[PDB]
Structure 1
Amino acid sequence: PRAKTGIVRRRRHKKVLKRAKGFWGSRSKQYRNAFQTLLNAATYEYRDRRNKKRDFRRLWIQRINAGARLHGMNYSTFINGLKRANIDLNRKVLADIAAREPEAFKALVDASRNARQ
């Protein structure tokens, strides 16, 4: 008994191709180039899952030291002034606090200075 490859290769291929959306060129229309894009695509996806965390952390920091600086301190001094006191252990989300509620974050700064010198 024979067994053509009928319908199989079409579906596989279509699954691949349907992945290609904002895909410029023949990346989105010719199978091979599509699949091939999908390799390096893998690479980027997987690494970016890990990377996005680095990114965000950086973001939050970049805000936090700004807040710090708005009063007369910095990020080093500020976080450190929450380490000396087991009191404040926010760390995460702090950026949102310096971005939305200024007064609160002022209070935190004042606390940091008070738990240092």
Structure 2
Amino acid sequence: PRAKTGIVRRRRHKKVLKRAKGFWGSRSKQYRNAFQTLLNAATYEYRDRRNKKRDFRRLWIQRINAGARLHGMNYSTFINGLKRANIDLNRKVLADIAAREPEAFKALVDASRNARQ
């Protein structure tokens, strides 16, 4: 018996061509280019998962030394204080305190200054 492609390819093709959403020009309309775009998208996808994790910590650190410097300190110094006050092991959350709770952030600056000098 004969077993022509019929239905299999078009379905295979529509799947790809639907991942292609706000894809500019041919990248959303023609299969070969839509599919091709996705290979490169795969690189970006797998990489950006572990990248966001560097991206955020960066943002986190930036907010910390901003507030640390508001109370005559800095990230390097502040963190060492909290480290030297072993009791203090915030690390995660610490950026939100600086940004939302200034009263609370000050307390932790004052504790960090002790454990150091």
Distance 1:19 1:82 in 2: 47
Could you report, residue by residue, the CA deviation over 1:34-72 in whole angstroms, capped at 9, with x for unpaired residues?
A: 000000000000000010000000000000000100010
Identity level (%): 100
Measure how far apart 1:85 and its partner are: 1.3
Question: Secondary structure of 1:115's partner?
Answer: helix
Flag the structure with higher helix content: 2
Distance 1:41 1:75 in 2: 36
Count of residues in correspondence between the two structures: 117
Distance 1:44 1:71 in 2: 40
Distance 1:24 1:5 in 2: 29
State the match for 1:60 in structure 2. 60
Distance 2:104 2:45 in 1: 38
Question: Secondary structure of 1:5's partner?
Answer: coil
Distance 1:22 1:96 in 2: 34
Unmatched tracts of structure 2, length 5 or more: none
Distance 1:58 1:93 in 2: 14
**CA RMSD across the alignment:** 0.5
Measure how far apart 1:94 and its partner are: 0.5
Unmatched tracts of structure 1, length 5 or more: none
Measure how far apart 1:93 and its partner are: 1.1
Could you report, residue by residue, the CA deviation over 1:68-103 in whole angstroms, capped at 9, with x for unpaired residues?
A: 000100111000001111110001110001000000
